[PDB]
């Protein structure tokens, strides 16, 4: 009923992506603390790392 600019759609894609990286980073931020005060032992290991 009400379409919009693909260019503005591009902006919305940009901002949702922004929130996506923020959440993704914060998610490993909690994971580090989880390992830390859950075992006192931790392994920071992944592909290309």
């Amino acid at each position: 009923q009400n379409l919009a600019d693909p260019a503005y759609r591009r902006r919305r894609i940009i901002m949702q992506n922004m929130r996506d990286e923020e959440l993704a980073i914060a998610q490993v931020e909690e994971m580090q603390a989880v390992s830390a005060v859950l075992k006192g032992k931790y392994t920071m290991t992944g592909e290309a790392f």
């Binding site: 940009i14 992506n17 922004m18 990286e21 923020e22 980073i25 490993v28 931020e29 580090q32 603390a33 830390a36 005060v37 859950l38 075992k39 006192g40």
Partner: protein
């Protein structure tokens, strides 16, 4: 280095590649190093 901002919490960045592919990209970088001064302060009891 170009902004001398190596020391920070996070790092946003945006950029774009030229040529017949017109493609921008967004880039975030940080070095999470979360640590605890007193490791033995907490006791992890695995309940059963």
């Amino acid at each position: 280095q170009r902004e001398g901002i190596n020391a920070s919490a996070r790092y946003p960045k945006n950029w774009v590649t030229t040529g017949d592919p017109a493609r921008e990209f967004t880039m975030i970088q940080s070095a999470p190093l979360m640590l605890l001064a007193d490791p033995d302060e907490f006791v992890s009891v695995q309940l059963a």
